[PDB]
């Protein structure tokens, strides 16, 4: 028994593609024989996808519910998952086992979906540090953020406290936004940015969040929890 | 100034949501405006996903490319974000906020947006222990697992080298399938299970996964890397 999988590729978001897994050695309309789908993302482990069963059953995940099918066509003898409006995180290798009666055996080799509208670069990471801090009121409180390109002083410091928007603080690195307060500065080292608040006060316990634009895509640092001590 | 945001709520994947972010105190049409649409997802950070600008430039993430589209209405002084063909991962806060001639002010107060067709339960979640381990050639190895909820004897181990697909060792608990090394074998405890290789061989430098069949969705294990000393 063997499954011959084929298909896949490089293909932009929003697209669609249909992976075929051909059956040798066996009928995919013999009772008790199953079709089933398993990806893997790049590093990752295994996702159960679908089922499809000889009397018609399925079962579907709901990571693709809505967007994929899955079918047995025993006229060629070849089942198929059809994927329709693909996601960069649908990326991973599909592979299509045999199913039987309940274990998936016989996989087929795997193919890799890689969705993507990009070129070869890479988006410019912002690394903010620390991820959280500790503070007092009236502390002096630093945070720093990097990104992994220049970025000039194209770069925007946010406030957000749970449940809330975000706020605008500083702009082009050291401008206040008006309306905020002065103990809010920023600065730039040439290698870093910081972001002081030069005395702490109870209305500042929030999470701070850089972000450049430089280029898009716009990107922010993971963000910096400023919690009580 | 504000925007003011509506829309939203829990949808199936595969279904489509229109967000609106209707303008006050400034016009969509006045040049130097833009509109940036951003999302969070439920504990992590920002990231961007559209920007539209009053002269029709426009730019989107690889994330929503070909699926979400966004516009700004002029008769209307309102913008949209079009979303389609939503998935799991699309599932966050979206915030609408002003762009101006470069940065993100007067954000809207953001809403939900959950993409999912589950009840309120949870799906079985299995655990392994170790996620690595280092072996000789000779040594007897032990990997256990365990699911969230009973799954009676429905557990199946695998196999999977680097660049492979998955293997089959051992299904319901204890049945070594054929063809498979005896030196595997499996067992439970009625609190976990366990898959015992009794004298490791070069051959079985692999990454194995448990994996349940109790219930749909059938799940996995994160796997355990057996790796040389």
């Known amino acids: 028994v063997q499954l011959v999988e084929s298909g896949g590729g490089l293909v932009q978001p929003g697209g669609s593609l249909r992976l075929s897994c051909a059956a040798s050695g066996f009928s995919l309309s013999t009772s008790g024989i199953g079709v089933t789908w398993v990806r893997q993302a790049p590093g990752k482990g295994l996702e159960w996808l679908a089922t499809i069963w000889w009397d018609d059953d399925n079962r579907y995940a709901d990571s693709v519910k809505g967007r994929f099918t899955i079918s047995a066509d025993t006229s060629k003898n070849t089942a198929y998952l059809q994927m329709n409006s693909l996601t960069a995180c649908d990326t991973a290798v599909y592979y299509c086992?045999?199913?039987?009666?309940?274990?998936?055996?016989?996989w087929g080799q795997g193919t890799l979906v890689t969705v993507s509208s990009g070129g070869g670069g890479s988006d410019i990471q912002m690394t903010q540090s620390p991820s959280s801090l500790s503070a007092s009121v009236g502390d002096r409180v630093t945070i720093t953020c990097?990104?992994?390109?220049?970025?000039?002083?194209?770069?925007?410091?946010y406030q957000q406290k749970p449940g809330k928007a975000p706020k605008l603080?500083?702009?082009?690195?050291?401008?206040?936004?008006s309306g905020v307060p002065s103990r809010f500065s920023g600065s730039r080292s040439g290698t870093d940015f910081t972001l002081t608040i030069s005395s702490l006060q109870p209305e500042d316990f929030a999470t701070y969040y850089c972000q450049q634009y430089s280029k898009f895509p716009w990107t922010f640092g993971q963000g910096t929890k400023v919690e009580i001590k | 100034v504000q925007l003011v945001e509506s829309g939203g709520g829990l949808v199936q994947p595969g279904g489509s949501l229109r967000l609106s972010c209707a303008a006050s105190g400034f016009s969509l049409s006045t040049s130097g405006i833009g509109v940036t649409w951003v999302r969070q997802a439920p504990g992590k950070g920002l990231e961007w996903l559209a920007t539209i600008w009053w002269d029709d430039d426009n730019r989107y993430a690889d994330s929503v490319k070909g699926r979400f589209t966004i516009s700004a209405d002029t008769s209307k002084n309102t913008a949209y974000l079009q979303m389609n063909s939503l998935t799991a991962c699309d599932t966050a806060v979206?915030?609408?906020?002003?762009?101006?001639?470069?940065?993100?002010?007067?954000?809207?107060?953001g809403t939900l947006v959950t993409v999912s067709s589950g009840g309120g339960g949870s799906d079985i979640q299995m655990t392994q222990s170790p996620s690595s381990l280092s072996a000789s050639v000779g040594d007897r190895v032990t990997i256990t697992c365990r699911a969230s909820?009973?799954?009676?004897?429905?557990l199946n181990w695998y196999q999977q080298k680097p660049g492979k697909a998955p293997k089959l060792l051992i299904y319901?608990?204890?049945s070594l399938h054929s063809g498979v090394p005896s030196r595997f074998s499996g067992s439970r405890s009625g609190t976990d299970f366990t898959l015992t290789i009794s004298s490791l061989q070069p051959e079985d430098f692999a990454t194995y996964y448990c994996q349940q069949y109790s219930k749909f969705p059938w799940t996995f294990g994160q796997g355990t890397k057996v790796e040389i000393k």
């Open positions: 909820q009973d799954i009676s004897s429905y």
């Open positions: 319901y608990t204890s």
């Open positions: 086992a045999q199913s039987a009666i309940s274990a998936m055996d016989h």
